[PDB]
Amino acid sequence: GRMLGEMWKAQLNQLTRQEFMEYRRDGIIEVDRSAARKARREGNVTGGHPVSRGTAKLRWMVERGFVKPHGKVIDLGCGRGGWSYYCATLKLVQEVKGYTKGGPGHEEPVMMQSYGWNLVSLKSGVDVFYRPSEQSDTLLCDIGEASPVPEIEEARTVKVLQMVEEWLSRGVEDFCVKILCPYMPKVLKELEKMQLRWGGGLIRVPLSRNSNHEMYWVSGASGNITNSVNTVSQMLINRMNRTNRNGPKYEEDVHLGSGTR
Numbered sequence: 525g526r527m528l529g530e531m532w533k534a535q536l537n538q539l540t541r542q543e544f545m546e547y548r549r550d551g552i553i554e555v556d557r558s559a560a561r562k563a564r565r566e567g568n569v570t571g572g573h574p575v576s577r578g579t580a581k582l583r584w585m586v587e588r589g590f591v592k593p594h595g596k597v598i599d600l601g602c603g604r605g606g607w608s609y610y611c612a613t614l615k616l617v618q619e620v621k622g623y624t625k626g627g628p629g630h631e632e633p634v635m636m637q638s639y640g641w642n643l644v645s646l647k648s649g650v651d652v653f654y655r656p657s658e659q660s661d662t663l664l665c666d667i668g669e670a671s672p673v674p675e676i677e678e679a680r681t682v683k684v685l686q687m688v689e690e691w692l693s694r695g696v697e698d699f700c701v702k703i704l705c706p707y708m709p710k711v712l713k714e715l716e717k718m719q720l721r722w723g724g725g726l727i728r729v730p731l732s733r734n735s736n737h738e739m740y741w742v743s744g745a746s747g748n749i750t751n752s753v754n755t756v757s758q759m760l761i762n763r764m765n766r767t768n769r770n771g772p773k774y775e776e777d778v779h780l781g782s783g784t785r
């Protein structure tokens with residue numbers, strides 16, 4: 525017996541390229557990044573433009589109380605820094621440490637002057653899978669690289685969970701962890717065990733593209749994991765089979781301001 529998500533992935537992989545591109549943003553929420561893309565090219569670091577689409581995804585979860593960043597924030601796989609710079613704007617946050625691998629094929633941290641930027645320290649050249657754990661109040665992780673092979677996505681997601689387990693054991697109050705492939709058996713088995721110990725629940729952020737099944741394990745949710753994943757799989761399959769496409773629903777990107785804290 526297979527999860528519905530396995531059927532979604534199989535159907536996704538059978539789409540033609542043009543079908544895939546018509547499907548991937550159909551009916552999703554998307555922030556208009558035109559001004560932000562221009563800002564990064566012009567070296568505009570004070571205009572409040574997020575360095576990535578990640579900022580809007582985390583803002584969506586924070587504003588709904590799914591995670592409450594505060595104290596010392598650690599951002600595993602910080603990339604350009606979208607999540608890290610966002611957290612630094614938040615009143616209860618006091619320090620942000622971001623780590624990311626960088627190098628060929630991987631995003632480097634971007635130095636910004638969004639509000640609270642002086643609270644942020646981003647370090648490239650760090651493979652978090654071999655970094656000793658550190659104490660934190662808020663633990664964030666947005667790692668996981670897509671593959672057409674569900675077993676590869678499954679293994680990559682399990683490795684993330686096994687790393688997060690070590691960091692959560694230092695004593696973490698709030699967390700938000702990307703689950704790249706929530707429908708495969710090894711991920712479900714691992715996640716149910718970690719939810720039993722650490723709590724939380726899985727949520728789907730509507731800014732995620734239909735072309736991926738990513739969900740976020742967040743301390744501020746509580747649902748049954750199997751049911752949560754199936755709900756997303758049915759929604760994504762329903763969208764795949766409704767062939768009068770409309771593209772995304774457009775909204776405004778986050779404004780991160782400027783200035784030190």
Ligand SMILES: Nc1ncnc2c1ncn2[C@@H]1O[C@H](C[C@@H](N)CC[C@H](N)C(=O)O)[C@@H](O)[C@H]1O
Nearest residue numbers: 576578601603606607624625630631651652666
């Ligand atoms: N083993 C690793 N160690 C550190 N960083 C990694 C590793 N594997 C992947 N990454 C990085 O993790 C990042 C994941 C991104 N989705 C993070 C985006 C970030 N949340 C933002 O808002 O911009 C990518 O930039 C990867 O290069």
